Design a protein around this ligand. Structure first.
Ligand code: ADP
Ligand code: ADP
Ligand code: TMP
Ligand code: TMP
Ligand code: MG
Ligand code: MG
Ligand code: MG
Lengths: 209, 209
């Protein structure tokens, strides 16, 4: 019976990476086959160009870089489909919603244009959005030095995330990411176990189509 | 007064590269400022991944590779816009129509999906399509060893080129590429001088939007 495709999204410092790793751990301890994936996936050739751009070691024209982030996803599709088909649940730290939110926060990029490259990807069974006080999120240390890590940019991407949340065909769940690490974890684990039990029942969908 | 953006398209061996170089030469000898561009532009980091894929030194998932060909274009947009704004006419050996025709010849790729990444690019003032007997085109030596260089694939891309030709908002001109090199050249040169004279009159357009 297939695994579920579970995505964690949220603004920076909302706890996506910590909860993603802890969810895989709890799922494996509850006897599921589960694995962690992340985007961008920095180890391929595309991913290294992307990693360079984000660290500001290089600049890349905005359209091209949007397309590189989408291709980075499509190159892992064969692996995603295979693992799900084998009953492995995949927990993914960011996906195409981050792709659309971060480019669409830039001037002159329509939401529509930014979604197209990602149309057709494996459609998540569950899209968790980790909500946190952008401020009460800055009290989570301090913006890193990477591109996009500043307040104003974060605010334009959060609006984009909110447009994408009006999709009713995507199973979006909000999570209050202000609680402790263990409490966020328990909320996430329960919605994920629920999605996994239903997933083995419907075919993997296609994103935005 | 801006330069014109002139694109040459056609199936393999139709003479796109030879006519492109000869057109730039004739335009420069007639006192215009003109330069040659080609896609893919193999000297950037993206272009090297693309060059590797085409030579079959590497394989790349079909969606990702489509997106890489489009990003390769967008990374030269700043340069395209600047040169045109300075009165330099640009002669481009293949553009987004080849991008759409070659991926859309693959199974399960809609024309619509394949056009999106390229929506918004600098809109050619003149799109020359070099028509030639796919057969009478094989008498132009023999298919190279690169990807896509086979009859059946060429036939599916020619159908895609034909769908794209129903656009009425693109100034498409057919050229009979079966004649000699010098005769094709003279036909091309005259339509290009004509487009250059009108171009200095309307703003550079946006492709497919
Ligand atoms: N619920 C939480 N409460 C407090 N600190 C947290 C919480 N979740 C994560 N942290 C810490 O906040 C920082 C950002 O967490 P991280 O998982 O990297 O978030 P993201 O991937 O969303 O940026 C890290 O130091 C992490 O350990
Ligand atoms: N009109 C023409 N007639 C005959 N041979 C031609 C003609 N144009 C080009 N050639 C030759 O055909 C081959 C393919 O031409 P080329 O310009 O590389 O086409 P493309 O870029 O469309 O593949 C080359 O050997 C070229 O010199
Ligand atoms: C997956 C993805 C991430 N991003 C962003 C969000 C973050 O700023 C950055 C990577 O950050 P991270 O290490 O916090 O996950 O890249 C895009 O701009 N496009 C994309 O497709
Ligand atoms: C520009 C472009 C070319 N192509 C193709 C057409 C040719 O097979 C190949 C490059 O060939 P060339 O050296 O004959 O111009 O790449 C795509 O598949 N996508 C694209 O965006
Ligand atoms: Mg993280
Ligand atoms: Mg559309
Ligand atoms: Mg050529």
């Amino acid at each position: 019976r297939r695994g579920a495709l579970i995505v964690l999204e949220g603004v920076d410092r909302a706890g996506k990476s910590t909860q993603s790793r802890k969810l895989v751990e709890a799922l494996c301890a509850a006897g599921h086959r589960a694995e962690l994936l992340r985007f961008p996936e920095r180890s391929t050739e595309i991913g290294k160009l992307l990693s360079s751009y984000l660290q500001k070691k290089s600049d890349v024209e905005d359209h091209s870089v949007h397309l590189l982030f989408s291709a980075n996803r499509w190159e892992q599709v064969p692996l995603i489909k295979e693992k799900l088909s084998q009953g492995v649940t995949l927990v993914v730290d960011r996906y195409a919603f981050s792709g659309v939110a971060f480019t669409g926060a830039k001037e002159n990029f329509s939401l529509d244009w930014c979604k197209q490259p990602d149309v057709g990807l494996p459609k998540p069974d569950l899209v968790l959005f980790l909500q946190l006080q952008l401020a009460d999120a800055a009290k989570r240390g301090a913006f890193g030095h990477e591109r996009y890590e500043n307040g104003a940019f974060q605010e334009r991407a959060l609006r984009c995330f909110h447009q994408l949340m009006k999709d009713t065909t995507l199973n979006w769940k909000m999570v209050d990411a202000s609680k402790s690490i263990e409490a966020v974890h328990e909320d996430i684990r329960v919605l994920s176990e629920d999605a996994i039990a239903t997933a083995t029942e419907k075919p993997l969908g296609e994103l935005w189509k």
